[PDB]
Amino acid sequence: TIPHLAIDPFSLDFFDDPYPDQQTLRDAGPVVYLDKWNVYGVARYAEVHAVLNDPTTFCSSRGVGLSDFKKEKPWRPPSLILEADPPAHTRPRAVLSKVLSPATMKTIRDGFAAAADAKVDELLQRGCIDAIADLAEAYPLSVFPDAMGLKQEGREHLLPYAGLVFNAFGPPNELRQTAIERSAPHQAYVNEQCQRPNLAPGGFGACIHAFTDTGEITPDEAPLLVRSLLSAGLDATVNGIGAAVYCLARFPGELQRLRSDPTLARNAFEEAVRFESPVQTFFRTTTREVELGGAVIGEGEKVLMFLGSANRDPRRWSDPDLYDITRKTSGHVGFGSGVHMCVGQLVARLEGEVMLSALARKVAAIDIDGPVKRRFNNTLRGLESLPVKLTPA
Template identity: 60%
Template sequence: MTIPALDADPFAPDVLEDPAPLHAALLAAGPVVHLPRYDVYALARYEHVHAALTDWQSFPSGAGVGLSDFRREKPWRPPSLLLEADPPRHDAPRAVLSRILGPRALRRLRPAWFAEAETLVERVLAEPEFDAVAELAQAFPLRVFPDAVGLPPEGREHLLPYGDHAFNAFGPPNDLVEKGRPRVAELSAWVDSRCRREALAPDGFGARIWAAADHGDITHAQAPLVVRSLLTAGVDTTVHGLAAALYAFATHPDQWRRLREDPGLARVAFEEAVRWQSPVQTFFRTADRDVETGGVVIPEGRKILMFLGAANRDPRRWANPDAFDLSRDPSGHVGFGMGLHQCVGQHVARLEAEALLTALARRVERIELAGTPRRHHNNTLRAWESLPVRVTLGPARADG
């Protein structure tokens, strides 16, 4: 079977601003599409993206989940033990984090995070117009998640630019990567310093990771890298997921009314927003051998580029995929990945979103755009730079 080719740059500014035309072209072209600009094989249809994500044996992550091939190029930082490693090296760090971020930890955090959300919303709603990215989507995760990890308050402003560069580095060495390069050493040094045992509060996620090293579950050399994984992926993706939900509601007043009438839909709303906007747009993997998928063979050692955003709107999988609809069951979306390398902190992100959206639904009768939103371009993430909104307050409602 001949592999169709598209002379397209997924990392060009116009595509990062609006990836829908490229996604449509990829979905129409076939199950596997060659992108000669980077000599990679693109998967955009849900069936094949899902299959590649879950088949780590055929498409491992150890050669990197970006365009760079770690077998031939030195990574800009030590590879992630979770995202950029495969079994057996991946297993122990994953088990430790899964336990630390499990149901018991979330039950313990729930009352405090819901209270923090109420406090933040009360303060922000003192003004009828505000930037929902800065005031809500960034402010809430930057408060509660680093607290849970055990970081001191000082320096948290470094987390977003560090994560921004980390996700940019998965793409080609373009202007976005160059923009972040001058601060890489400074930001990396700050993050590395906060991963040390002595920098972390004794009762947070970070301290529990170090305790797992003391117990022999992971090595002491692995512990700071596992903490770093939390700080790299635990903020940006949640920020952009929350911004996606707020944008969705500001542009879909009927769906906001549904949430206000039934705040119990907060988690469904977040999942649907992640499906609809896909804050993580793409990830790479590498073929471990000649792999047949979609009727074609991807040669051993070649990179594949999985378009999670396209898969999450594939009409073969989703009815009316471009609609943001709280009556939909969005489970099965690939916005958090899938399979062995699925986002280990996704339940934490869901709790943050549930807390913030529930607090807003109790107070806000209507949310609408108060200006033109501005995108923040990133090689991997679909993000907002600014989301000006106007809110109309209504009578406070009890939790649903």
């Protein structure tokens, strides 16, 4: 049978320390039922990977939040890529894959690297930073909106709106109702910024629009894809970088290894993505009755995937609670898995790689310099404040 648990994965206590409850979720069985929200849940690597790699049984077109779009009206027009299934998902997926492709990385790498190095040097002209306010947020705010091709102003909308989106994937708790209620202004700005005239060419958004004459996407779809990049392209990377700095502070041996060989920077970042999993959870909806882990789930049921749990499953990872910058990270689900696997993962890995490389070449020590404060969000895991003293190299 399926065990029934009262754990609330969208409660502040859970956000404050999810790992005990995540173990309870893994050990209760391959498939659990969360009575708090009447949803099924999967927290082991095996089942998370199985669900992710069966997107037509466990579909996304009925929403990847708790809300089932077949039963409730979406708070915003459904995402044409995240909240779509094959075949509708194809050509937007391919378009964003070409926009955020290797070649585009070739076009943005030097700028991103210069911005990273420059921020690290600016903060060595500081010493005692809040690694969130001064580094994790500042850098992606200083590079990503430009890479999107957004006008200089209104970029401030980006952090709110993104956050809003991620709070909206959660249940109707006070975080979600907090986010959605009267968020109109952001919704306005974003809507206006997704239009071709307001996006500087050569940026990601203008390239999306540019692809509208190829027959993969139509002109009415481009603004929603620009919206997608503007919603998923900032806060996740912020929390990811904050996670990387956090780990390097908590595992000084790993910082020393990284300094010794800056070429591990990329894998360092990847390990942080596994270790903290900035995107903690995502939902699917069953399109039919389906058997998973010896249990049977009815049609039209929400299934909650615990990505961070899958990334700390001792059934899959040796020493899962240890940050190891030489760990082989292939197979982790911090970026998802399958047809929906993060189409912008090269951008995230670029930002994190160049930031951790800057730290590696320019910083000798990172020692937490105050109270660590967590940032609470229905979907995202990250830090509100990470006070550290940076000792230069």
